[PDB]
Amino acid sequence: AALLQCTADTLADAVLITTAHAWQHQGKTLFISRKTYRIDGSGQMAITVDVEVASDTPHPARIGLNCQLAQVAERVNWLGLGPQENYPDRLTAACFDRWDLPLSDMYTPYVFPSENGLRCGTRELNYGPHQWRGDFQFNISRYSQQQLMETSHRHLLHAEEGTWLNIDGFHMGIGGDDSWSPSVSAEFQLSAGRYHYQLVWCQK
Amino acid sequence: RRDWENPGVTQLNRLAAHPPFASWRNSEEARTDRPSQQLRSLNGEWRFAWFPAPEAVPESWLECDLPEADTVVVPSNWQMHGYDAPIYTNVTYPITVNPPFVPTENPTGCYSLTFNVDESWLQEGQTRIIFDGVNSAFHLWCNGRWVGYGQDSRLPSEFDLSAFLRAGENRLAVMVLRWSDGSYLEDQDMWRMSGIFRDVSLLHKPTTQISDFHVATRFNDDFSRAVLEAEVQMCGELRDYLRVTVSLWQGETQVASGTAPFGGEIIDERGGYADRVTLRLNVENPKLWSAEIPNLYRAVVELHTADGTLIEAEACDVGFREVRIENGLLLLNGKPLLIRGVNRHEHHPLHGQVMDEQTMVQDILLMKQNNFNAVRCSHYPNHPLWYTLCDRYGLYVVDEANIETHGMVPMNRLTDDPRWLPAMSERVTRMVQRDRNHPSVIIWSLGNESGHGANHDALYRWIKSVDPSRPVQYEGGGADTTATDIICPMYARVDEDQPFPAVPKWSIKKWLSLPGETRPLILCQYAHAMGNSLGGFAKYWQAFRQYPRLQGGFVWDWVDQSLIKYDENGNPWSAYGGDFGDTPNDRQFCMNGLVFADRTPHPALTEAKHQQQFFQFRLSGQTIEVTSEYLFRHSDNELLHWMVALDGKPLASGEVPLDVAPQGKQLIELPELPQPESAGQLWLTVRVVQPNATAWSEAGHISAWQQWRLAENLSVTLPAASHAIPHLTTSEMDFCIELGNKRWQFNRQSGFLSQMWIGDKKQLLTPLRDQFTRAPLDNDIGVSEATRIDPNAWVERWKAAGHYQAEAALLQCTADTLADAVLITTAHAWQHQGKTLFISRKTYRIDGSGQMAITVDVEVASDTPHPARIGLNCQLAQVAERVNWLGLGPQENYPDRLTAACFDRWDLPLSDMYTPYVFPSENGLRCGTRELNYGPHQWRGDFQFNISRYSQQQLMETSHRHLLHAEEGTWLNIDGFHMGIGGDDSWSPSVSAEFQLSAGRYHYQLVWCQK
Ligand SMILES: O=[N+]([O-])c1ccccc1O[C@@H]1O[C@H](CO)[C@H](O)[C@H](O)[C@H]1O
Ligand SMILES: O=[N+]([O-])c1ccccc1O[C@@H]1O[C@H](CO)[C@H](O)[C@H](O)[C@H]1O
Ligand SMILES: [Mg+2]
Ligand SMILES: [Mg+2]
Ligand SMILES: [Mg+2]
Ligand SMILES: [Mg+2]
Ligand SMILES: [Mg+2]
Ligand SMILES: [Mg+2]
Ligand code: NA
Ligand code: NA
Ligand code: NA
Ligand code: NA
Ligand code: NA
């Protein structure tokens, strides 16, 4: 990430932070992320994200944010699709409701580890004293993407400190027509060029 | 006798049907197709009188001209001269349904002509008159004596006048009935007119003559050898000294010839046809005919004495081609066709249904220039010259019997009735007898929209017996009945099934594989081009290319059937159904053409040209792969032009010759290309250009194009810190912002930007407000009418949900001062009767540079009908001469109809940004736009827009383009999102799901600045 801009303004009832970053590689700009954070008297933090994706770079796996929360909580409660893991091109069986599961059920123990446990169509997500509202997809577990991508057998994974939270405005389909040739359908690739998403983080 | 109320009497004294004759008396003139002294035209000035019923015609008229008659031009349709009104009705018959009777009030056209006959025509042989087209039934007298009668408005009626004429002056009297029992078989969706609307001619034939001739061409397995077989029949004085010689010419060279005496092979226990002869000519390496290369030979049929006297000669253009269906595919000369077709009615906005060569040529040129290779004669045999033109210019033709009984209930009531077989039979058999030697005709059709009756099965079989060289198709009764060799539906969708009972319209892809089905599928009508339409067209072409058995279709249709009317000031205007007092009528349903009545293109034409290209392209790196979809020709009149530009700025370009064999591929690797690091999108555009002119196109004609986004450099450059900060001033009613010479005013009660000044000049006539509706397109309305609402049509769903009447309720409006800008924030709710339909949340940020960034986030209730658009609108104070944009163009383009548009920098006169569809609706959008310039303003973002002198309100409230009036200022509509326009049909919602605005939440952003 390269910073392009970071500013702070005070509004009548809130503080507004504005940021812009470019992601580049071998001098090419791959992605540009523009955001605003607006914190008001209610203590809610509203995040708006607008992303540009160069038309000539391969369509990305996802467009979201991530962080390692310091807290580890027993349950996960969300208003969205579930209860089991679901992805864009594999979510017909999931139902929209309010689900509540132990954190470990939010991780799928695929023998060969990878991105896993996403839930889509989520309007509200609760974990510990935090609450996220918006229209996103998410996964939450003790394992970072880095670890999963560096690990070849589930038995070698180890819980990291805290909880890794991945909250996506958009996520690419997973495909599966076969496992030896790209099989994610066009309608499930993130090829729009410009993406917008917004979330509200607040304390519960 | 009221012969016009008896389907059992379709003619009296009419001569047999046959292919075009000219009775040349010199074979070289027959070979060259020059005029024949034996074939005269009687077209010109005639005498005409209109009567309200045949009972009102005075008997004196048979013997002499009526003083009150007018002199008028023939051919003509009398409605075109104002004698009575033409009627525009689609399905419902224009008369009370009570076969076989017609109204006692039945407009009768009394035509007459005094003309001369040279004595020599009466000294020997036979003199006949030919009426190529009389609508709908007529009696004929010559010199006051009754000659005969005829029905079928679309084929020639010929009568022998030999015994009625006298040397010098003669007078014809033709009493034409507008309505007859023939009318029950003429219910096509078009203007209902009448008159002697095709040519009238007089033909002299010798007593011993060629009465019919049929030409067939059969081939060997690889088409390198053929046998031309010509069966010739004679009438007259049959003697042993008679011969027929058939010679075949390629230009001035005679390639083959055969001569034989009369007497065909034995055919049964009673012998053979002593009055017939079959000549068989061997032809090596014949030049084959196709729409791609319309190679023709000339066959001359000489009837002569063995000792050398030519009695008469007849002749035709011959196209060596074989048409056959094998293994589920329609093949032409052994290769599977891909039909780029269109249905074409015979229509002229001034002359009605009268055709002329200029207009036909004009239509053929434009069809070919727009990549069409086929035409269906919807829904009757055409004027004879059409065929000649298609043979010569090269178009595949579906020749269709003049049988349409749509208005019956059920639709096969007459076609399944044996009492209507004779009348139907004549319409089929006489067509085949007239047009069977034209190579352009490749498929026969039994008529249209007449259900499926036993009569179709009998006639299907008759054709198959008499002419095995061409398949037979017929869509009625479900499009895949036993009366059709090709599954030929109308308006079946690509992927969406429409399972109506009895006659379902399956997705075309699904249709082909139904259990036991094996026939090819070619749509007899697809993509209803009514008003702003053709949305989804590309979907059809992708399917046709992917599925071998999906071999194309005929677009509905070529030209709008609008008629010209003149206002108080004598200025012409385009009229449609009901504009002549005609009622009931089907209003604008008569305009469904790719082109306007005067042949000006509608924007959809370019979409069709593009999807119907004959060269396919793929890009890999700097390598372009060109694939030919021609079946028979090499790319011998083609070159590839290529050009690379960055945001409209040309960086490099070139040309490469195209040398691809039919169905072949060519790889072209482009030169080291530009790799600028300046921000923007790099686009490659390629065009196939025909350097040499052809019979149907000018040198430099573009036949194909395609574009690809090459590299993109996103802008990362920070803008320069401003030497200013805008000031905010507040009052209870407004937020005013000022910066330099610019000012912005936001109304606190309405919550919208109400005014902007550049200098001292106001820029807006109406405030900037959200807009979720559009002036409805013909496809949005479908069949809905005030008197009979169709609740399922998009327009009605929007209306009923309150979209057009919703009022913006302000929920919030604040202004804040930032470090280097002023920020206005607003939120509005649109409700209707208690229902919140949409919520619009925006920010407007005006900075020290004077630009205004507007961010819009809209929520749309999931249970309200998907809205037509999500955008902003305002009436600008300025009227500027031009419009310049960086986006798709240059023509109007909508989300489901934009493949033909190209991304570039375009610049046009304001008026070209409006499309003058006869029935006004939303129009002129351009999509994929990144920057728009108009007068002093510039808008940047990623949006679609339209800009013109007409508000959406006016367009939706006006029914005819000539009644629109330019408003003050310019109406600008800038949409973040716009719904598809549809068009698979114009009577059932046809916007594909992927083009409906059903996301629920939408975001868009624009920067408006001045320059
Ligand atoms: O046959 N119909 O009852 C009918 C009702 C409403 C709309 C179209 C329609 O039929 C359709 O009309 C279009 C009009 O351009 C064409 O004539 C097409 O051939 C016909 O099937
Ligand atoms: O046929 N039309 O072109 C047409 C235009 C506007 C309204 C009704 C209409 O045709 C009418 O359509 C209804 C179906 O909705 C029936 O098929 C009716 O028989 C037909 O005349
Ligand atoms: Mg009759
Ligand atoms: Mg000779
Ligand atoms: Mg003589
Ligand atoms: Mg019809
Ligand atoms: Mg009507
Ligand atoms: Mg394209
Ligand atoms: Na892994
Ligand atoms: Na095909
Ligand atoms: Na029509
Ligand atoms: Na060439
Ligand atoms: Na209108």
Curated annotation (Swiss-Prot), chain A:
Family listed: Belongs to the glycosyl hydrolase 2 family.
Species classification: Bacteria, Pseudomonadati, Pseudomonadota, Gammaproteobacteria, Enterobacterales
Site positions (Important for ensuring that an appropriate proportion of lactose is converted to allolactose): W180
Residues of the full protein shown: 821 to 1024 of 1024
Transmembrane segments: none
Oligomeric form and interacting partners: Homotetramer.
Swiss-Prot/TrEMBL induction comment: By allolactose.
Domain of life of the organism encoding this protein: Bacteria
Binding site for substrate: W180
Consequence of substituting W180 to F/G/L/T: Decreases affinity for substrate
Record organism: Escherichia coli (strain K12)
Protein name: Beta-galactosidase
